[PDB]
Structure formats: C-alpha cells, structure tokens
Design a protein around this ligand. Structure first.
Ligand SMILES: Nc1ncnc2c1ncn2[C@H]1C[C@H](O)[C@@H](COP(=O)(O)OP(=O)(O)OP(=O)(O)O)O1
Ligand SMILES: Nc1ncnc2c1ncn2[C@H]1C[C@H](O)[C@@H](COP(=O)(O)OP(=O)(O)OP(=O)(O)O)O1
Ligand SMILES: Nc1ncnc2c1ncn2[C@H]1C[C@H](O)[C@@H](COP(=O)(O)OP(=O)(O)OP(=O)(O)O)O1
Ligand SMILES: Nc1ncnc2c1ncn2[C@H]1C[C@H](O)[C@@H](COP(=O)(O)OP(=O)(O)OP(=O)(O)O)O1
Ligand SMILES: Nc1ncnc2c1ncn2[C@H]1C[C@H](O)[C@@H](COP(=O)(O)OP(=O)(O)OP(=O)(O)O)O1
Ligand SMILES: Nc1ncnc2c1ncn2[C@H]1C[C@H](O)[C@@H](COP(=O)(O)OP(=O)(O)OP(=O)(O)O)O1
Ligand SMILES: Nc1ncnc2c1ncn2[C@H]1C[C@H](O)[C@@H](COP(=O)(O)OP(=O)(O)OP(=O)(O)O)O1
Ligand SMILES: Nc1ncnc2c1ncn2[C@H]1C[C@H](O)[C@@H](COP(=O)(O)OP(=O)(O)OP(=O)(O)O)O1
Ligand SMILES: [Mg+2]
Ligand SMILES: [Mg+2]
Ligand SMILES: [Mg+2]
Ligand SMILES: [Mg+2]
Ligand SMILES: [Mn+2]
Ligand SMILES: [Mn+2]
Ligand SMILES: [Mn+2]
Ligand SMILES: [Mn+2]
Ligand SMILES: [Mn+2]
Ligand SMILES: [Mn+2]
Ligand SMILES: [Mn+2]
Ligand SMILES: [Mn+2]
Lengths: 392, 395, 394, 393
C-alpha cells in the first residue's frame, strides 16, 4: 500500500511507476514491450508481497524496489536492458550527489537548505550598540572598580578590539569558493554582523578613552605573537585551491571564531555575573558571543559538508596540522590572558580557571569535526565557568 | 595689515607669520644652507608683498597656495637657490601625497578618507525590515477574489517584474570592496549585501503565497523580459573587470539606472493601487520598505561616482557622457516596454501609462543631473505632479 | 581454437583464459559470493560463447570489450546476480576513470595522454630560423631602384600588415599550460612561444632596414587597422578566462582564424612577387619560413580543439557553431578590407584582389571543415587554382 | 669647453645651442622671454662652466651639472615662472625615466632594460638538441666498460641530473606575469624552450642507459626527499601575488637552484671524460647544459640587481640572513647528494673533498654577485683542482 521515497517520505504504492521505469529501459534499447514491462512489474510486486510475509512491519524503499527490478531483469531474457538499467540508475545516483565548490544552474531547490537556519539565527540575534546603556559602566570605572580590576577590563577591551575593530571580509567573500545561493545568503548576513561588532567595540574604545592605547597595541609582543597565529590560520583565505581554502575555513571557524575572543567574553561577563557591574558592556559582549557561536557553528557545518564530500582530504597529515595549529592558538591565547592580568589576577576568576575554559573550548572544536581531544581537563576548575555556557 | 589666511580646505584662520618662517627654516635646515635669521628675513619679504596686494590694491585675504608661490619667488630672488628648488619639489610631492585614491588601499583604519559614507550604514539600520513583520492575509484574499481581471493581471505582472530582479543572487554591493578597498566602503557594501538577502526572502515569499512560482520560472522566455535582461547585463558588463575605469562604468549604470529606476515603475504601481483602492496592504508596506532601501543604494552609488569623477576628471569626457546618455535611453525604452507588458490586459484609470512614463523620464533626468550631466527628457510638469505623492512617501 | 585477443590499445596478444578466470574471481572475492572453481566454470562458458562467434564470423578475434560483455552476460545467466551487477558497475567506473581530461592535471609525467602532440615540438625544431640566416641585400636594391610606385606601395603595406601582428608581445601559446596542464602541451607552448620571439625579431629588423619604423608607429591610427584590431581582440576576449568553455572559444578563433588566415593574404603577396617578378629574395625566404611556422601553430590548435570536442561534445551545439560562423565572416570582412588597403595605389596584374579573396575564403572553409563544421564560402574553382602553388610550398 | 658627459655616461661634442634651445622651450611654453633672452642665459651658463675648466681643474661638465646651472641662472634672472616650470619639467622627465620592473608600459620600444636582449642572443648561440650528439660509445661504456664503483657513480649522477631536468619546468616561461616587460618576455620564452630541450636530452639518456625504472623509484630515497625539500622551500613564492615574496623565489632559484644544484653532477661527468676518456657523448650533452644553466643563473642575477637598485629597502639584514640560511640548507642537501652518488666508493681523480670545495665556492660567488658577503672558507689548493671546469664553460 505504501513506499518509502529517497527523501524518506512515505507515498502510496503505484505499480505503474515500476512498469514505466522498466518500459523506458526497454524503449531505450529497442528490446522488450509494454507487455514485457508489465510481466516484470508483477514479478517485482509478487516478491515485495513475500517480504511482508517474513515481516508485517515491512514497507519497501525506492532503492529496494530498484534492486528488485534489476534482479528480475537479470533473470529475464533482457540482459542488455538489465545492464543498461544498472548503469543508468547508478549514473542518476552520481548526478544527485552535491559538490559545495561547484556552481549550480537553478536557484531553487537548495542543495543545503539546513544552512538557511543561520540567516534566521542572525536575524534573531541582530543588535546595534545604541540599544545598550553604558552610563553605569562609565561610573563603575570612575567610582567602583580597583586599579587591578580596571587594568584587567582595559586589557580585555583592547584584546577584543584587536579582532573586532578591523576590516573583516572572510564571511562576505565565502561565496567566491562555495558558490551556493544559500551560502551567499549566510555570508552576506554574517558580513553585516561584523559591521555591527566593529561599530560596538569602536564606540567602546571612544567612550572608555582607549583610542590612543588601541593604536599602540600592534607594537606589543603578546599581540604580535597573536597576529602571527591568526594570519598563519588565514594563510589560504584567498587561495584558488579548494583543499587549501578548506584549511582556512577550518582554522578560522574552529579556533578564531570559537575560541580567540571567548577568554575575553568570559572576563567581562564574569565581572557582571559576580559583581553586577559593567551592565551595558556585558550586554554587548553577550550579544557578540551569541553571534560568534553562530559564526563558528556555520563553519563547523561547512567543514562537515566538505569532509562528507571529500573524505580523502582528511588524512593523518591534515589532522596533525589541525592539532599543531590548535596548540599554537592555545599557547598564544594563554599569553594574552597573562598580559590581561599583568597588574594582578582576579580572586573571583583566576588564570587557572580561564585556562581550563580555553582548553575545553579547543577540545569541543576538535570533537565537532570528528577529531580526538588535545587537552586533559581538571573537571573541578572547569565547573567554575559552567554558568558561561548556560547563558550563551 | 594681514589678519587672516584662506587654508587648503577653503576655511579661514588667523594669519601667523611664524608659519611662513618655519616653512622656510625647514627647507633651509634640510640643505644646511641658511639660518632662522635668514628665514625671518625672507618671511618679512613675503609679508611686505602680501600687504602690497591687500589695502594697497583690492582688500583681499591671501591663500596658503598664494603664500607658497610667494615664498618660492623670494627664495629665487635670494642667495638660497638650492633651497628654492628643494622647496618647489617638496611642496609638489606633498600635494601629490595629499590626494585620496578610492581604488588604492590605505595603511591605517582611522582616520577615514570618506567619513560621509558612514551615514549609509546608519540609513540602512534605520530602514531595516524582514517580510515576517508584515501580514499578507488581506493581500492573498484581494489577489485571489477581490481584484478585477484587468487589476489582477497588472498586479501579477508587476510582482513578476519586481521578482526578476529581487529573487536572484545579488553580490555587486558585497563585492564593491575588492576594487574600492576602503574600510568605510566595506562597511556599506556588507550592510547593502545583507539588505539584498532580506529583499530576496520577501519577494520569494510573495511568489509562493500568491501562487506565482510556475509563472516565475517561465518569465525568462518572455521577449520583454529578455530585452530587459539584455540592458541589465550590458550595464553590468564590467562588474568583475580588473580595470578601474571599466568597473566605474558598471557602478555608474548600476547605481544610476538599475538601483534608481528599474524597479520604481513597479514600486509606483503597487503604491498607487493601495493609495486609491486601499488594497494589497501587506505587499504595499513591503514595496515601500524596498523602495526606501533602493533609494539609499542608488544614493551611495551617486556619491561613489562623484568621488571617482573628482579624482579622475579626465575619464568623464563627452564620449563617455554620450555612452551614459545612450544607455539611459536603452534603460528607458526597455522599462517603458515592461510597463506596456504589465498593462497588456488593460491600463488603470487611476494610474495611466502616460503618468508612469513621465515618472520614469524624470527619475532618469535626476540620475543624470546627480552626476552633473544634462537632462535627457522634456517633462510635462502636470503629468509629473500626479506622482509627486510617491516621492513624499519615499522621503 | 581462440588463440588471440585485441587489447584496449588495439595491439594483438595471445589469448589466456586465466585472465577471464581472475577477473571473475576478483568480482566474486569482493562480494564473498562464489569460489575459484565457480569463476573457472563461468570462464569456460565465456570461452564456449566466443567459439560460437568463430563459427559465425571466420577468423574471429575477440576484443577485450567483447570478452567483458560476454563475462557480464554469463554472470547475469548464473546464480551470482550481485557479482554480475558489481562487475558491470566496476567495469564501467574503471572505463570512466580511463577517460582523459585536457583541463585536468595528471599525477605522473609518463605515460603521455596525448603523445601525438610531441610531433609539434619536432616540427618547430625542424622549421627553426633566425632572420640573420637570410640576405636582404638584393631586396633593399629592389625596394629602391627596382620596383614601380604601385608595386612598392603594395610591398610596404603588406610588410606593415604582417608587422601589425608579428611586431608585438605574443604570450598566448606560452600561457596555454595554465588551462591545459599537460607536460606534452607545456612542451609545445614553450617551443611555440620562442618561435614568436624569432618572428618578432625578424619583422622588427625588416621594419628597420626598409625604413618603415615611423610608418609602423602611425599604423594604429588607420581605420582598416582599427577594424582589424577589433576582430583580433574580440577573438581573444576569453584568452585569460578561468572558465574552460570560454577559454576554448579563444583557442578556437585564435588557431583557426588568427593563426591560419590573418597573415596568409600578406604571405601570398610576398611569395607571388618572388615567383612572378623574381624579386625580394630575402624577404620571401623569411615570409616562407614564418608561413611554415604559422601552419604548424594553427595545426596544433586544430588538434587541441578536436581533443576538447571529443571530451566535451555537449559544448559544440548550434549556438556555438553560429558564433564561429559569425566570427569567421567578421574575420573575412576585416581581412578583405586589409587587402583593399594594401592595393590602395593599384592592383597587381599577376595577383589580383579577386584571386586573393578566393584564396582567403578557401582558407576559412578549410578551418571550419577541420573542426567538423560546414564550408561557409562559395568558391570559384578557376580563380582558386591560381594560388594552389602556395599550398604546394608550405 | 669641447665635450660633455651624457646621461648614459658617454662623451659627446659640446653644443651651446642645446642649452639655448632647452631655455627657449621653457620660455616658449609660458610665453615669457625670447630667443635673445635664452641666448643671454646660455652664455651665462657657458661662462660659469669655463670658470670650472681652464681656470680651475681641466674638468668636463655632465648633462645634470649643465641642467643645475641652467636652473640657477633662470632663478637669478627676471624669469622666475620659467625657472619654476623648468625645475618641474626636468623633475617630471626624470621621474618618467625611472623604471619599475614590476610595472607594465604603454610602448614596446624603446626598451627599459636593453642589456637583457643579450640573453636571447646567448641562448640562440648555445642552442642544441641531443640528436646532435652520438651516445653509442657511452651506451657500451655503461653496459661493459665501467667498474662497479665508476658505474654506480655515473648512474647516480645521471639520476640526480634527471631529478631536476626530467620534469615540467615553467618558472622562466611564467616570469613575464610578475615582470611584465617585452624584453623579459623574450628571455623567458627563450629560456622555457631551452628547458624543453634539456628535458628531451635527459629523458633520452634515461632510456638508452636503462635507468627509467630506477628513476621512478628515486623519489623514495631520503637524500632525494631532503633535496626536494630545499628546492620546494626555495620556490615557495614562485606563484605569489606580492612582488617582494616573488623576488625571494627568483633569488633562491637563480642564485642557488640554477647556478649550483646540478653543477656537482656536471663536474662529475666532465671530470670522468677528462680523465677516463669515456662518456664522450654524455659529456658533450652535460657541457651544453652547463653553458645554458650559466646563462639562466646570470639573467636571474641581473634581474635581482635591477630589483635591488629599484627597491633597496627590501634588502635589509633580515632578508640577507634568510638568503644565508637558505644557502647553507642548499649546500647541506647538495653535499648529501654527493655522498649518495659515491655510496659504493669515491673516485681517485675526483674526491668528495674537491667536489665540496667546488660547491662552497659556487655558493660564495652567487652571494658576492648580488653584493652579499661570502659564507664558506675555501682551501685554495683543493679548489685549483677544478679550475679546468670554469675554463670549459
Ligand atoms: N509510488 C511508487 N510506487 C511504486 N514504485 C515507486 C514509486 N515511486 C518510485 N518507485 C520506484 C519505481 C522505480 O523502480 C523507481 C524510480 O521511479 P520514478 O518513477 O522515477 O520515481 P522517483 O522515486 O525517482 O521520483 P521522481 O518522480 O521525482 O523521478 O522507484
Ligand atoms: N534511457 C534509459 N536506459 C536505461 N534505463 C533507463 C532509461 N530511462 C529510464 N530507465 C530506468 C532506470 C532508472 O533507475 C529508472 C527511473 O528513471 P529516471 O526517473 O529517469 O531515473 P532515476 O529514478 O534513477 O533518477 P532521478 O529520479 O534522479 O532522475 O528507469
Ligand atoms: N595661519 C597661517 N598664517 C600664515 N601662513 C600660513 C598659515 N597656515 C599656513 N600658512 C602658509 C605658510 C607656509 O607657506 C604654508 C604651509 O604651512 P604649514 O605650517 O605647513 O600649514 P598648513 O596649511 O600646511 O597646515 P598643516 O598644519 O596641516 O601642515 O602655508
Ligand atoms: N624637508 C624640506 N625640504 C624642502 N622644503 C621643505 C621641507 N620641510 C618643509 N619645507 C617647505 C615646503 C613645504 O611646502 C612647506 C611646509 O611644510 P610641510 O607642512 O611639511 O608640507 P606642506 O605644507 O606642503 O604639505 P602638508 O602639510 O600637507 O604635509 O615648507
Ligand atoms: N590475453 C588475454 N586473454 C584473454 N582475456 C583477456 C586477455 N587480456 C585481457 N582479457 C580480458 C579478461 C577480462 O575480461 C578483461 C580485463 O582483464 P585484465 O587482466 O585486467 O587485462 P587488461 O586488458 O585490463 O590489461 P591490464 O593487465 O593492463 O589490467 O580483459
Ligand atoms: N573489486 C571488483 N568488483 C567487481 N568487479 C571486479 C573487481 N575487481 C575486478 N573486477 C572485474 C571487473 C573489471 O572490469 C575486471 C578486470 O579488473 P581491473 O583490471 O581491476 O579493471 P579493468 O580491466 O576494467 O580496468 P583497468 O585495467 O583499466 O583498471 O574484473
Ligand atoms: N651636446 C651637448 N652640449 C651642451 N649641452 C648639452 C648637450 N647635450 C645635452 N645638453 C644639456 C643641455 C640641456 O641643459 C640638457 C638637455 O638637453 P637635450 O637637448 O634635451 O639633450 P639630452 O641630453 O636630454 O638628450 P636627448 O637629445 O635624447 O633629449 O642637457
Ligand atoms: N615644455 C617645457 N616646459 C618647461 N621646461 C622645458 C620645456 N621643454 C623643454 N624644457 C627644459 C627642461 C628640460 O629638462 C630641458 C630639455 O628638454 P627635454 O629634452 O624635453 O627634457 P629632458 O632632457 O629633461 O628629459 P628627456 O631627454 O628624458 O626628454 O629643457
Ligand atoms: Mg526518477
Ligand atoms: Mg603643511
Ligand atoms: Mg585490467
Ligand atoms: Mg632631452
Ligand atoms: Mn565579530
Ligand atoms: Mn565572527
Ligand atoms: Mn533589492
Ligand atoms: Mn539594490
Ligand atoms: Mn608569428
Ligand atoms: Mn603564431
Ligand atoms: Mn635545465
Ligand atoms: Mn635552468
């Protein structure tokens, strides 16, 4: 009575669909007739009937029906039709496969409609800094935070602005190498969120009087070693080779988007969760974290589409490079944290707790692709930042 | 005496003789020929000649460049000939370095070379909308049962015409930073690019809910649409060119004619329909929001063209102005034919083709005039006044 | 009774039944259905059906593909249906992988995919020439105290027209390996590129010694030349394109019309002069040497197009074929105008424009026919016969 | 004043009318002054030049000294506007006369670097095909005439040459993309075709010597993998879109790859024929390849010196330490290739010590050619043993 289609949907069983598929294979070779096709269809039907005998819960698949058609054509006089059927079916199956790097003729239907959720995610998360009030935050600096706390916040703000207050064009340019309408939609939507993040942190540098301090940040050794791993990771961002460009997406989504700013997002939101201070800045950092989580997630999905389509590319040589880069990302981010707390650590958020938080983020990134974790974790120290992931 | 000076930016400032002395002293120090005492002597000569021009002849304010020309003249009249020559060369080199090039990348993020362009990001953030904010329930009812066959055919054709531009992959603005590598331009491009994602989603939804998906796939086979695709593709011929001059022609025709005129006859039809018949409420709200964002898109293009013209005036000769004028006529011919096709089953009493055609002719003239070019069409101000309400709702 | 087999490379080899047995056993091993014993039984059936063909043919020799079709047929007739299906798919997959793609890079240097293309390197090594090998002394004497004003104007214009193409930077052949990344194509590219340096140096020297350097700088302003530059640039529109189908149009128009027809009216004019008037002995020698090298250049391009057509037949539709025929006519119109300009001061009695025009029309038809297209020009066989000596000199 | 030094440093007869006309043209351009005024200014320039000659040090004026003098007299005169316009026009003409190797140009002629045309003439002169040589004697020398030690050394030397030569080589043929000059395009295309000839020659030698199978397996040898590593590192930026990165590739390629990588192997084959009077055919082919490799590296040295002269800022201590670092890595790997060639034993007439000094010296000459200091200490006695090699080339 029913059939499971290729898209896993159920549809009413129509024997004429089997008859016509056989008749078309027959017509293509000039061997057989509508009468012969009807006979073969019945043989296929009688066989399906016998499968409902072994199991009452059985409903045939389109691929099970196809395998059966082929088997009956091999058992018949129409061997040339059987061979042509096998080849034709296999050719259509190969044509139905997707290539993320290849352009398509038609706009609709989408090849990866699940990616449309990323446009909806950013439209939901959409924010402008002008929606927040930084008045309490300015006062927290004037008459509520200690020299040690104010140095840590200043350094954290500067570290976020290093990445955020810049020209960011990776997502906006992703459609040049992944030429899909659904990816272009995501790319454009993410590019604009990067304009909003720039405007937020550029405003915060202004109102906090950190503009001069920001221009001189590039000359700091800790920042130069950070710029070095960031630029190394984006080495192939403009490459014409699809495998080289995949390395850029990988390191960018997994480590840049998902770990580079989160030691800093943690610090600002720690001050707020703990002391109920930095209200406006915390709101802006939380909204950034939410959009950064969406950015990294899309990258993880893109990598998994690439891996599924080109599994050969993901060998031991590739996996050792990712693990090499992951460690260099950690060592550089750990030294950024050391610089943030140059004037002293915070009793409520020590460097040890921040370092476990980073190590874990890097492991989750590795695990998201299908790689084994790189760091051993102190579960007790990690539990101290469980509140962060509950809020994002 | 001399109390004021006109600066390079044409602003006025109090006259300070030490500024002339220091400029001369620095030229002298660079060569090791002359002293502050000699510089002071030359400054006075410059000052005395500046007075001879003022109260003595026409009651003027000297310019920084008139001062510079005078410094050079006194240096040549003095013993410091090597200083005179070095001053001439340094001044000219500083003049060249001071120029902005929209096509060249700059070293530092701040200061911005074109900070006026930042207003376009603010404009789109203000005009920002998603179709999910509107309710198209009444519109679906109007279209399926509430419209006459003449009205329905016109609306269907208008919707299809908007969708052949809007329901497509649009990456021009998102890619503008490749040839115009400025942070402030990159910000505008990204914001405009996302606005096109929203425009696509809106008209794609409208094709779905109005049951026009099948008529949309078959639209490409229509002669009027093929003729439209032809001028649109001709206009974007150099959109991916590596020559800055060729690429400028693409920005020009795209901003001035594609962004400012191609969809506006259709935008006018939907607006006039709601205005007179109080129908197509949701679609009207969506068309109005698209019109506002298209006006912003074309405006940015106009500004970009005027920056390019100011920096490369040689590129904008009579041969290139005749090409724009010709393409403007081809854009009008094709859009006028689109309007004829929209009203194939009959014209609307409240909005005749004659009123639509004057509205288009005027939009094309404003585009030409916005770029310092001569108007192309002669306008009947009476037929044009019938669509004045449209420019009220967009501004 | 079956002693030989035709292999895939069309070579004949002794028939070995164990080769059939092992192919069946590998398909059987891959699925875990059957045994070596079952494979030998299927082999015997295959051998038996091959003999039935020998009964009907005569000295029937099976091909590897006929043996393959037979293996499949016996597997379908047997209990091993899964093995028959897997054999069909594997054989077909292996055949698809064996196909060549001119635009794709290969892993190994040897074996060559197109070894016939190596002949072009040998062809140029044979035709290789430097202008310094010829003597232009008699030519300088002819060009002053030997030619009439009509003859001298024609020669100067012919030389200038040749130089319009030859005295320039030519990098198409040298850059062909970027889009057709084959070692054998890279060899031809480099060899053809150097020949262009030799062609440039030749015509640049002739402009110097004939005192045509000033006339050459002001040739670009001539309407006939601007019209020529227009079709030449249109033809090379996609020469640096990143799309393989667009780039193929550039190779096509370039090899077929630019290389094989653009300079040939001029080559014919100079040759005619040495043949009939017995003059310009040095210049005729260089022109003949260039003609032979241009014929080699266009020929390689024709071979490249035929490889592309064989591999992507879908690309060569009616829309494509109408563009080639459109461009072929524009090439002819522009070249016919060039001939009119060469003879602005008067035609030559031994070589009239009508004879030159039939010569061109025919060259364009041969180009079209070389890539399997229809002959586009109406030919006066009598007027054409007047220049058959040229082709009987390349 | 009888003669003047021109911009190209050539001497020419002094003509005062050349000064008069330059002044008159500056005057004519503004409509300020006359030929009479130009003549007066010319004389002032002449008189001041005369003051530096007969009266001072028997000097010869240069075009730029005459130009500075013209400007000085114009500044001393009433024509301050033409004095200024002269200064600007002279400086504009001087800026236009500057060359940028990375930039295109409107006109084919005149050439910016006409000295580079000599490289096309050099290759046309050195042009050869392997079909011109007779390898009959060589084939038998290899099968039956060589000892086990000698045979192994020749086989390894041939395989080492072929590692570089039997391959697709497109660097020179692609140089015009980043150095877009007609004169560079001419050398590049000429050099690219010579590499096709080199490929055909060593591919034929692998065939006739029965080394095709040993060649396919050569890639798996640790010494060869180590060699491929420095060669690929050196050509890291060969396809880069940055002019400074691409310059590093040209540098390492011309100086070390072209001028040194194959020269130990070229020396082995030459020395063998010289001493043993065997491998006459192969020696002829090797000598012809050595001659064309010397031309290839020389053009590269000239290109680097043009780049250095135009962008001196690029050649700092950080850059120079990288070249010296890469030069040592090239030497280490090449010396390892020498050890592998003689794995079955050294040659009495050509020991590894003599080959190693020969290499060290070649690397020093490369460094010195682009104005860098040497790196290796040389044993002049061991080096003298290979002076015949440089005489042959
Ligand atoms: N509803 C059905 N009832 C019975 N057999 C079916 C049905 N749908 C598909 N099949 C089987 C018959 C053939 O063996 C095979 C392919 O048939 P076909 O008519 O092309 O449908 P389909 O599943 O490929 O979808 P589509 O209509 O989009 O091509 O699947
Ligand atoms: N020309 C033919 N030669 C051989 N078999 C054929 C031919 N035409 C149809 N068939 C058979 C084999 C196919 O699996 C079956 C259904 O046909 P068809 O709908 O065209 O393809 P399909 O179901 O395999 O894939 P798809 O739905 O992606 O088009 O009919
Ligand atoms: N206020 C002034 N009073 C008199 N002369 C002035 C004044 N400002 C500028 N000048 C003249 C003096 C010199 O000839 C020439 C350049 O002087 P300078 O001190 O560099 O100022 P400026 O106009 O270039 O501004 P800036 O501070 O941006 O360099 O302009
Ligand atoms: N090093 C120098 N050599 C020669 N002339 C000099 C030098 N320094 C200063 N001068 C002269 C010429 C300059 O036009 C003038 C003012 O100097 P400066 O402010 O540095 O340049 P400027 O006003 O022309 O341009 P800008 O202010 O835009 O950099 O003084
Ligand atoms: N000499 C032969 N005698 C009989 N059958 C043969 C012979 N050579 C090939 N075949 C048939 C047997 C199989 O059906 C089919 C493929 O067999 P196979 O052993 O792979 O040889 P081949 O022709 O593909 O060459 P290769 O050894 O390079 O793979 O061809
Ligand atoms: N793994 C297998 N699954 C199914 N059939 C197989 C398998 N291995 C061998 N065969 C069958 C089908 C092949 O055509 C035949 C000969 O095998 P094979 O030499 O590997 O391929 P082939 O001769 O078709 O192509 P080629 O020689 O070019 O690789 O044996
Ligand atoms: N032979 C000469 N005798 C005297 N002055 C000369 C001579 N040649 C050049 N000069 C001086 C005069 C002017 O100041 C300056 C430029 O003069 P000019 O006539 O343009 O010659 P040149 O050196 O630039 O060569 P060219 O003829 O190629 O332009 O050089
Ligand atoms: N139009 C002019 N305006 C100002 N000075 C001029 C003009 N024409 C000639 N002169 C002066 C300045 C020049 O240096 C000099 C010689 O003229 P010219 O040969 O044209 O340039 P040049 O010798 O400096 O460079 P070049 O040889 O590269 O052309 O005469
Ligand atoms: Mg189907
Ligand atoms: Mg200044
Ligand atoms: Mg096989
Ligand atoms: Mg001159
Ligand atoms: Mn961000
Ligand atoms: Mn981000
Ligand atoms: Mn839009
Ligand atoms: Mn728009
Ligand atoms: Mn040629
Ligand atoms: Mn040619
Ligand atoms: Mn070589
Ligand atoms: Mn070389």
């Amino acid at each position: 009575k029913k059939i499971i289609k290729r898209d896993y949907s159920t549809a009413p069983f129509v024997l004429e669909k089997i008859t016509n598929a056989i008749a078309n294979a027959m017509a293509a070779l000039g061997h057989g007739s509508e009468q012969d096709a009807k006979l073969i269809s019945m043989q296929v039907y009688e066989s399906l009937l016998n499968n409902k005998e072994q199991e009452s819960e059985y409903i045939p698949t389109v691929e099970q029906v196809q395998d059966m058609v082929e088997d009956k054509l091999m058992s018949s006089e129409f061997h040339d039709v059987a061979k042509a059927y096998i080849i034709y079916r296999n050719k259509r199956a190969l044509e139905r496969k997707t290539n993320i790097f290849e352009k398509r003729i038609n706009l609709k239907p989408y090849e990866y409609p699940e990616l449309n959720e990323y446009v909806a995610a950013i439209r939901h998360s959409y924010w402008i800094h002008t929606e927040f009030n930084f008045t309490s935050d300015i006062q927290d600096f004037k008459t509520g935070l200690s020299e040690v706390e104010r140095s840590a916040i200043k350094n954290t703000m500067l570290a976020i602005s290093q990445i955020e207050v810049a020209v960011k064009t990776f997502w906006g340019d992703v459609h040049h190498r992944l030429p899909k309408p659904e990816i272009a939609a995501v790319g454009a939507t993410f590019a604009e969120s990067e304009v909003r993040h720039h405007d937020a942190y550029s405003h915060l540098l202004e109102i906090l009087g950190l503009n001069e301090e920001f221009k001189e940040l590039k000359k700091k050794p800790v920042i130069m070693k950070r710029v070095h791993y960031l630029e190394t990771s984006l080495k192939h961002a403009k490459s014409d080779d699809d495998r080289e460009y995949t390395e850029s997406i990988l390191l960018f989504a997994l480590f840049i988007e998902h770990v580079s700013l989160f030691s800093q997002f943690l610090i600002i939101m720690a001050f707020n969760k703990h002391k109920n201070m930095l209200k406006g800045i915390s709101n802006a950092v939380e909204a950034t974290s939410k959009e950064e989580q969406i950015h990294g997630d899309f990258g993880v999905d893109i990598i998994n589409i690439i891996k599924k389509e080109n599994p050969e590319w993901f060998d031991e040589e590739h996996n050792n490079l990712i693990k090499e880069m992951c460690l260099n990302s950690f060592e550089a981010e750990s030294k950024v944290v050391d610089w943030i707390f140059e004037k002293g650590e915070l009793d409520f958020l020590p460097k040890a707790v921040i370092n476990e938080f980073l190590k874990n983020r890097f492991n989750k990134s590795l695990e998201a692709i299908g790689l084994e974790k790189l760091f051993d974790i102190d579960e007790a120290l990690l539990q101290e930042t469980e509140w962060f992931d509950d809020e994002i």
